[PDB]
Enzyme design. Structure first.
Site, PDB file in Angstrom:
ATOM      1  N   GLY A  22       6.821  -0.020   7.946  1.00 37.70           N
ATOM      2  CA  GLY A  22       8.186  -0.507   8.332  1.00 37.70           C
ATOM      3  C   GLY A  22       9.283  -0.151   7.277  1.00 37.70           C
ATOM      4  N   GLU A  52       6.767   6.802   6.183  1.00 41.15           N
ATOM      5  CA  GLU A  52       6.753   7.396   7.346  1.00 41.15           C
ATOM      6  C   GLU A  52       5.232   7.409   7.841  1.00 41.15           C
ATOM      7  OE1 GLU A  52       9.918  10.133   7.599  1.00 41.15           O
ATOM      8  OE2 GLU A  52       9.162  10.750   9.777  1.00 41.15           O
ATOM      9  N   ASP A  97       1.261   0.808  -8.312  1.00 41.79           N
ATOM     10  CA  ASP A  97       1.622  -0.174  -7.207  1.00 41.79           C
ATOM     11  C   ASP A  97       0.912  -1.087  -6.954  1.00 41.79           C
ATOM     12  OD1 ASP A  97       3.899  -1.002  -5.857  1.00 41.79           O
ATOM     13  OD2 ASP A  97       4.203   0.614  -4.764  1.00 41.79           O
TER      14      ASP A  97
HETATM   15  C1  LIG Z   1      -0.986   2.142   1.465  1.00 45.48           C
HETATM   16  C2  LIG Z   1       0.086   3.229   1.610  1.00 45.48           C
HETATM   17  C3  LIG Z   1      -0.029   3.976   2.720  1.00 45.48           C
HETATM   18  C4  LIG Z   1      -0.915   3.882   3.713  1.00 45.48           C
HETATM   19  C5  LIG Z   1      -0.909   2.867   4.874  1.00 45.48           C
HETATM   20  C6  LIG Z   1      -2.196   3.098   5.874  1.00 45.48           C
HETATM   21  C7  LIG Z   1      -2.184   1.873   6.565  1.00 45.48           C
HETATM   22  C8  LIG Z   1      -3.277   1.955   7.491  1.00 45.48           C
HETATM   23  N1  LIG Z   1      -3.510   1.089   8.422  1.00 45.48           N
HETATM   24  C9  LIG Z   1      -2.715   0.272   8.733  1.00 45.48           C
HETATM   25  C10 LIG Z   1      -2.805  -0.839   9.683  1.00 45.48           C
HETATM   26  C11 LIG Z   1      -1.982  -1.861   9.758  1.00 45.48           C
HETATM   27  N2  LIG Z   1      -0.844  -1.520   8.714  1.00 45.48           N
HETATM   28  N3  LIG Z   1      -1.410  -0.146   8.006  1.00 45.48           N
HETATM   29  C12 LIG Z   1       0.189  -2.012   8.205  1.00 45.48           C
HETATM   30  C13 LIG Z   1       1.047  -2.337   9.337  1.00 45.48           C
HETATM   31  O1  LIG Z   1       2.117  -1.928   9.327  1.00 45.48           O
HETATM   32  N4  LIG Z   1       0.480  -3.099  10.398  1.00 45.48           N
HETATM   33  C14 LIG Z   1       1.567  -3.480  11.487  1.00 45.48           C
HETATM   34  C15 LIG Z   1       1.122  -2.957  12.918  1.00 45.48           C
HETATM   35  C16 LIG Z   1       2.098  -4.918  11.428  1.00 45.48           C
HETATM   36  C17 LIG Z   1      -0.542  -3.870  10.442  1.00 45.48           C
HETATM   37  C18 LIG Z   1      -1.784  -2.880  10.599  1.00 45.48           C
HETATM   38  N5  LIG Z   1      -4.357   2.885   7.386  1.00 45.48           N
HETATM   39  C19 LIG Z   1      -4.232   3.935   6.397  1.00 45.48           C
HETATM   40  C20 LIG Z   1      -3.034   3.847   5.436  1.00 45.48           C
HETATM   41  C21 LIG Z   1      -3.182   4.718   4.715  1.00 45.48           C
HETATM   42  N6  LIG Z   1      -4.092   5.957   4.437  1.00 45.48           N
HETATM   43  C22 LIG Z   1      -1.951   4.870   3.553  1.00 45.48           C
HETATM   44  F1  LIG Z   1      -2.018   5.755   2.549  1.00 45.48           F
HETATM   45  C23 LIG Z   1       1.029   4.841   2.803  1.00 45.48           C
HETATM   46  N7  LIG Z   1       1.996   5.142   1.964  1.00 45.48           N
HETATM   47  C24 LIG Z   1       2.141   4.377   0.796  1.00 45.48           C
HETATM   48  C25 LIG Z   1       1.076   3.347   0.706  1.00 45.48           C
HETATM   49  N8  LIG Z   1       1.349   2.642  -0.556  1.00 45.48           N
HETATM   50  C26 LIG Z   1       2.545   2.394  -0.436  1.00 45.48           C
HETATM   51  C27 LIG Z   1       3.799   3.437  -0.284  1.00 45.48           C
HETATM   52  O2  LIG Z   1       3.129   4.494  -0.010  1.00 45.48           O
END
Ligand SMILES: Cc1c(-c2cc3cc(Nc4cc5n(n4)CC(=O)N(C(C)C)CC5)ncc3c(N)c2F)cnc2c1NCCO2
Length: 264
Positions: free
Chosen positions: A12, A17, A119
């Site tokens: 969000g 993105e 972070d």
């Molecule tokens: C950690 C991160 C990422 C990153 C995020 C990821 C999220 C996931 N899975 C999931 C599963 C869920 N969510 N996320 C959160 C979510 O919105 N809900 C919603 C449906 C309420 C609940 C279920 N899986 C992999 C990810 C991955 N690889 C990433 F790199 C990208 N950019 C970043 C950061 N750090 C701070 C700024 O930059």
């Protein structure tokens, strides 16, 4: 785009993105991160991401399409610890303990590669369906969240100088966060929080309830939240601390938490 089917925007704006996608040839779930000019410089930064830790979200591939970069990663089904605690409530002392050890192992790898996460916070510690704790290794967006800043990072806005030891302070704030559902001083103006750190007599934060936690958890918070960076222990030094070197610490603690997330 032609190989994966996009499904849900995650974060969000917090992550940026990020998309929950499904492979057309495998059917497996992945995370696709879109990053907002040169071709040759883009292919060099990707090769260094394939060369991988147990506590780091694994790289899968990259896609340069119509001025958009698609960083592919593994999908952690449960989301971040913040998403989890907004449903389960505060974590147990042993759950926090295990989470700290896992984060400390990831930081030991990151800091060894001369990288600084910057972070470390509840919303940036992902938990996959398998009960595993993973961090993410990545004019640009200023990285850092006021409440989780080490004093040498907050003070940087006047007298510069910080190193990899800030991630140890951020983990300390995150331990308090996982216990009380909010970091210390969440109710206070961010400039005031980061201003009181820069003044004399500054007292690093502690858990509000003394009686709810052990002396080892209280010492972990005292040690990780050392005002002086010179005296703050390294990720490897922290791994030998009584709290994260306890014997009962296993992935099952998180399989229990993930069950409360399913039905509380
Ligand atoms: C950690 C991160 C990422 C990153 C995020 C990821 C999220 C996931 N899975 C999931 C599963 C869920 N969510 N996320 C959160 C979510 O919105 N809900 C919603 C449906 C309420 C609940 C279920 N899986 C992999 C990810 C991955 N690889 C990433 F790199 C990208 N950019 C970043 C950061 N750090 C701070 C700024 O930059």
């Amino acid at each position: 785009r032609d190989h994966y089917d996009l499904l849900q925007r995650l974060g969000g704006g917090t992550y940026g993105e990020v998309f929950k996608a499904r492979d057309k040839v495998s059917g497996d779930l992945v995370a696709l991160k879109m990053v907002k000019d040169d071709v040759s410089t883009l292919q060099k930064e990707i090769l260094i991401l394939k060369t991988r830790h147990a506590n780091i979200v694994a790289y899968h591939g990259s896609y340069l399409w119509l001025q958009k970069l698609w960083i592919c990663m593994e999908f952690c089904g449960a989301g971040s610890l913040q998403d989890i605690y907004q449903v389960t409530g505060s974590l147990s002392e042993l759950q926090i303990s295990y989470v700290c050890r896992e984060v400390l192992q990831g930081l030991a790898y990151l800091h060894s590669q001369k990288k600084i996460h910057r972070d470390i916070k509840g919303a940036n510690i992902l938990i996959n369906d398998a009960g595993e704790v993973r961090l993410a290794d990545f004019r640009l967006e200023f990285i850092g969240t006021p409440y989780w800043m080490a004093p040498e990072v907050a003070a940087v806005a006047l007298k510069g100088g910080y190193n990899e030891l800030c991630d140890i302070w951020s983990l300390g704030i995150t331990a308090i966060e996982l216990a009380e559902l909010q970091p210390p001083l969440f109710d206070v103006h961010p400039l005031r929080v980061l201003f009181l750190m820069t003044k004399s007599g500054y007292q690093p934060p502690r858990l509000k309830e003394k009686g709810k936690w052990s002396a080892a958890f209280h010492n972990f918070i005292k040690v990780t939240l050392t005002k002086s960076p010179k005296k703050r222990p390294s990720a490897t030094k922290m791994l030998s601390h009584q709290l994260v070197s306890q014997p009962g610490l296993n992935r099952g603690l998180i399989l229990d938490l993930l069950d409360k997330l399913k039905n509380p």
